[PDB]
Amino acid sequence: KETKNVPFKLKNAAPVIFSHDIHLKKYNNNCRICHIALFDLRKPKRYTMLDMEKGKSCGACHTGMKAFSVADDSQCVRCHSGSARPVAYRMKGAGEAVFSHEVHVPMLEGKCRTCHSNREITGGRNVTMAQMEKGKSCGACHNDKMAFTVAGNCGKCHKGMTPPKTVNFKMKGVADAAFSHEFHLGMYKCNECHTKLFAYKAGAKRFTMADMDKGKSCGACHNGKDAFSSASDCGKCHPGLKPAKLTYKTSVGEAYFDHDIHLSMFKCADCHTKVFKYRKGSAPATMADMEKGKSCGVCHNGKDAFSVADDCVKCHNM
Ligand code: HEC
Ligand code: HEC
Ligand code: HEC
Ligand code: HEC
Ligand code: HEC
Ligand code: HEC
Ligand code: HEC
Ligand code: HEC
Ligand code: HEC
Ligand code: HEC
Ligand code: HEC
Ligand code: HEC
């Protein structure tokens, strides 16, 4: 008649190869047996180990009597002759998690079933860290007793994760932005932030101070209500940054803008955002403009401060 092997595809480990060439020399070419009921063949199904113990599938001949059991906690490898294949955890928003037998077997004995029978381990699908922090799966063991708690070592199980003590933000025109994880941890839980507020990988939309006031990034908390104002105090997130005495490179010489003199009559709010950006890389306003009303002329126009027109010496060195 001619017929041969058929494998069983398993989403999390080496497949199981059924073998006609065996169960044939035994039953003697009788077919109706496994194919009239045991295995449909027209619209077959996927059975769990249990569904076998309960008689269905291979559990309808591999009891212990006719042929060894699908329950002998030390006679599984008879079928699951597998070649290993660490477990792949792909989550839309976290470091691909991995679990593998080869480093867990030699920790109980060869105990399989301890896990594959413990409905609170191999039960749920798409488990969470909530569900897991309450003993269900993984944290069944890893629960502050048998093994390290699950409220930690995230990099141990997940791909990369493991948080950095201090993070640096490179900036052009400003300086540098320092933020401390350590200190921000003993105050919050991962998901309070990750992912909504920030991501794990290493790219995404590099927000802007302005964006913050909307509710994103540091501004999600730093706004003057929950945490300190994303508006001022600058000397916090940005190290040495300090409003100081600049020096312009102008066609007719040098221009001088002292911050101090102005910061005794004004607040960053007055100028900055609407009138003067911070980044060195701006757009040079012309004295033509400063007369129209723009730049220094927003207030420097005789009525308020004094006009750009006259007194060219005050802001210039010629
Ligand atoms: C008489 C010699 C047999 C014929 C005719 C067929 N089988 Fe089998 N068979 C068994 C299993 C575990 C499967 C898997 C089915 C599933 O996973 O859904 C199969 C598969 C087949 C197929 C496909 C053949 C192929 O080469 O792809 C057909 C059409 C089929 N079988 C015909 C189990 C058993 C079994 C239990 C001991 C016996 C005695 C036989 N099969 C015998 C025959
Ligand atoms: C699910 C489709 C099955 C898997 C997986 C396996 N079988 Fe069977 N099987 C049956 C008998 C009577 C024997 C021979 C006698 C014995 O050694 O106990 C077998 C043997 C196996 C083996 C061992 C092969 C070897 O000689 O080393 C494996 C790994 C195996 N089977 C896997 C009978 C039946 C049967 C009853 C009609 C069914 C439904 C299955 N086997 C199903 C599977
Ligand atoms: C004795 C050495 C063991 C055998 C044989 C197998 N395991 Fe495991 N295993 C564990 C987990 C969390 C999973 C993932 C969830 C799932 O797969 O449903 C697995 C998975 C398997 C699978 C395949 C699963 C599938 O859907 O195809 C097989 C065939 C398998 N395991 C064989 C966890 C554990 C565990 C708890 C600590 C132990 C020690 C073992 N597994 C041991 C065995
Ligand atoms: C006082 C008003 C502040 C000045 C001066 C600036 N900041 Fe910040 N800042 C913060 C972070 C995390 C970054 C990097 C953001 C990212 O990489 O996505 C920065 C960056 C800037 C920039 C560029 C973006 C923009 O145009 O707004 C400028 C010009 C800048 N900062 C000036 C964080 C913080 C923060 C911690 C909560 C505070 C209080 C400040 N920055 C304050 C100011
Ligand atoms: C009487 C009309 C004045 C003469 C002489 C000039 N200025 Fe000024 N000026 C000031 C700043 C901050 C700049 C730099 C602006 C930038 O970098 O975007 C300048 C630049 C110039 C220039 C270039 C513009 C042009 O081509 O016309 C010239 C020619 C120049 N300044 C001549 C600041 C001030 C200021 C301090 C408050 C006053 C009152 C004036 N400038 C007045 C004159
Ligand atoms: C050959 C008869 C097997 C023995 C012996 C054991 N398993 Fe098995 N297993 C086998 C097959 C053919 C299949 C699935 C086919 C299908 O219809 O889907 C499986 C499946 C599993 C599973 C998935 C089921 C579940 O976990 O809910 C696991 C995890 C698995 N097998 C584990 C396992 C263990 C630890 C065994 C001892 C209890 C065991 N299997 C023996 C075939 C065979
Ligand atoms: C292994 C030793 C882990 C530890 C410790 C932590 N997690 Fe975990 N986590 C692990 C696995 C295998 C899974 C998959 C669960 C499943 O559905 O099968 C998870 C899943 C996550 C997820 C995705 C689900 C969700 O909560 O949205 C997240 C958010 C995640 N893990 C986060 C996370 C954090 C924040 C951890 C430490 C602070 C961490 N995990 C530890 C395995 C392990
Ligand atoms: C809110 C105050 C946070 C909490 C609590 C946690 N994290 Fe965090 N994390 C936060 C920020 C502001 C940033 C910087 C953004 C950047 O892209 O650098 C991060 C960054 C990380 C990273 C590094 C990403 C990278 O640079 O490639 C990781 C992987 C990370 N955070 C992990 C992590 C873990 C596991 C936490 C719980 C212990 C945790 N963070 C909490 C802010 C916050
Ligand atoms: C809400 C979830 C926050 C996020 C995300 C960030 N910060 Fe934070 N930060 C938070 C709180 C609860 C406080 C309160 C204010 C206080 O007085 O501590 C803080 C504090 C800081 C500090 C202040 C240091 C000091 O005041 O002496 C720094 C250095 C700081 N935060 C920086 C910072 C940066 C740059 C962040 C985004 C990249 C960031 N924080 C996020 C709450 C939250
Ligand atoms: C006008 C009334 C201002 C006041 C008061 C403050 N700033 Fe200022 N700032 C102003 C100008 C004209 C410029 C540059 C214009 C250009 O586009 O080149 C600046 C620049 C800065 C910068 C970057 C340069 C530097 O000082 O290193 C920073 C860091 C800055 N200003 C910060 C800042 C802060 C902290 C203020 C309030 C406490 C503040 N400025 C007031 C104009 C005005
Ligand atoms: C409106 C809010 C201002 C902006 C924007 C800038 N300046 Fe100003 N400046 C302002 C006032 C009201 C004054 C005080 C004197 C007065 O009669 O109004 C100042 C002063 C100066 C001075 C020195 C004056 C003194 O020492 O007596 C300089 C050096 C000066 N301002 C420079 C300057 C430049 C270059 C500006 C734009 C790049 C600028 N100022 C903006 C009000 C305002
Ligand atoms: C049952 C027992 C479990 C379960 C349900 C999971 N793990 Fe795993 N694991 C367990 C123990 C007690 C240990 C040893 C702890 C100790 O030394 O005290 C481990 C260890 C880990 C490690 C290795 C750490 C080491 O080398 O010591 C990893 C890689 C790990 N566990 C991952 C992991 C994942 C991803 C799980 C969910 C799929 C998981 N374990 C479940 C005990 C058990």
CSV table of N, CA and C and ligand atoms in Angstrom, one decimal, residues 4-6 8 18 20 23-24 30-31 34-35 39 41 44, ligand 1:
chain,number,residue,atom,x,y,z
A,4,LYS,N,4.0,6.4,5.2
A,4,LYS,CA,5.1,6.7,6.1
A,4,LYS,C,4.9,7.9,7.0
A,5,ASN,N,5.8,7.9,8.1
A,5,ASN,CA,5.8,8.9,9.1
A,5,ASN,C,5.1,10.2,8.9
A,6,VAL,N,4.6,10.8,10.0
A,6,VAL,CA,3.8,12.1,10.0
A,6,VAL,C,4.2,12.8,11.3
A,8,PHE,N,4.3,16.0,14.2
A,8,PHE,CA,3.3,16.8,15.0
A,8,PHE,C,4.0,18.1,15.3
A,18,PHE,N,5.4,10.8,14.6
A,18,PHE,CA,4.6,9.6,14.8
A,18,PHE,C,5.3,8.6,13.8
A,20,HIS,N,4.5,5.3,11.5
A,20,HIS,CA,3.7,4.3,10.9
A,20,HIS,C,4.5,3.0,10.9
A,23,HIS,N,4.0,1.0,14.4
A,23,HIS,CA,2.7,0.6,14.7
A,23,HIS,C,2.0,0.0,13.5
A,24,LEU,N,2.8,-0.5,12.6
A,24,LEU,CA,2.3,-1.2,11.4
A,24,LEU,C,2.7,-2.7,11.6
A,30,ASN,N,-3.5,-3.3,9.5
A,30,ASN,CA,-4.9,-3.0,9.8
A,30,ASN,C,-4.9,-1.5,9.9
A,31,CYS,N,-5.8,-0.8,9.2
A,31,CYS,CA,-5.9,0.6,9.3
A,31,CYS,C,-7.0,1.2,10.1
A,34,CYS,N,-6.7,3.3,14.2
A,34,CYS,CA,-6.4,4.7,14.5
A,34,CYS,C,-7.1,5.7,13.6
A,35,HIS,N,-7.6,5.3,12.4
A,35,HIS,CA,-8.2,6.3,11.5
A,35,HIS,C,-9.7,6.4,11.4
A,39,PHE,N,-8.0,9.0,15.1
A,39,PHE,CA,-7.5,10.2,14.3
A,39,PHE,C,-8.4,10.3,13.1
A,41,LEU,N,-8.6,12.5,10.3
A,41,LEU,CA,-7.9,12.5,9.0
A,41,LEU,C,-8.7,13.4,8.0
A,44,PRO,N,-9.2,16.4,11.5
A,44,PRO,CA,-8.4,16.2,12.7
A,44,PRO,C,-8.3,17.3,13.7
B,1,HEC,C1,-2.9,1.7,7.1
B,1,HEC,C2,-1.5,1.1,6.9
B,1,HEC,C3,-2.9,3.2,7.4
B,1,HEC,C4,-3.3,4.1,6.5
B,1,HEC,C5,-4.0,3.9,5.2
B,1,HEC,C6,-3.1,5.4,7.1
B,1,HEC,N1,-2.5,5.2,8.4
B,1,HEC,FE1,-2.0,6.6,9.7
B,1,HEC,N2,-1.6,8.1,10.9
B,1,HEC,C7,-1.5,8.0,12.3
B,1,HEC,C8,-1.1,9.3,12.9
B,1,HEC,C9,-0.5,9.7,14.2
B,1,HEC,C10,-1.3,10.3,11.9
B,1,HEC,C11,-1.4,11.8,12.2
B,1,HEC,C12,-2.7,12.4,11.9
B,1,HEC,C13,-2.8,13.8,12.4
B,1,HEC,O1,-1.9,14.3,13.0
B,1,HEC,O2,-3.9,14.5,12.3
B,1,HEC,C14,-1.5,9.5,10.7
B,1,HEC,C15,-1.5,10.0,9.4
B,1,HEC,C16,-2.0,9.3,8.2
B,1,HEC,C17,-2.2,9.9,6.9
B,1,HEC,C18,-1.4,10.9,6.2
B,1,HEC,C19,-0.3,10.0,5.5
B,1,HEC,C20,1.0,10.8,5.2
B,1,HEC,O3,2.0,10.1,4.9
B,1,HEC,O4,1.0,12.0,5.3
B,1,HEC,C21,-3.1,9.0,6.3
B,1,HEC,C22,-3.8,9.3,5.0
B,1,HEC,C23,-3.1,7.8,7.1
B,1,HEC,N3,-2.4,8.0,8.3
B,1,HEC,C24,-3.4,6.6,6.5
B,1,HEC,C25,-1.7,6.8,13.1
B,1,HEC,C26,-1.9,5.5,12.5
B,1,HEC,C27,-2.0,4.3,13.2
B,1,HEC,C28,-2.1,4.1,14.7
B,1,HEC,C29,-1.2,3.0,15.4
B,1,HEC,C30,-2.0,3.3,12.3
B,1,HEC,C31,-2.1,1.8,12.6
B,1,HEC,C32,-2.0,3.9,11.0
B,1,HEC,N4,-2.0,5.3,11.1
B,1,HEC,C33,-2.2,3.2,9.8
B,1,HEC,C34,-2.4,3.9,8.6
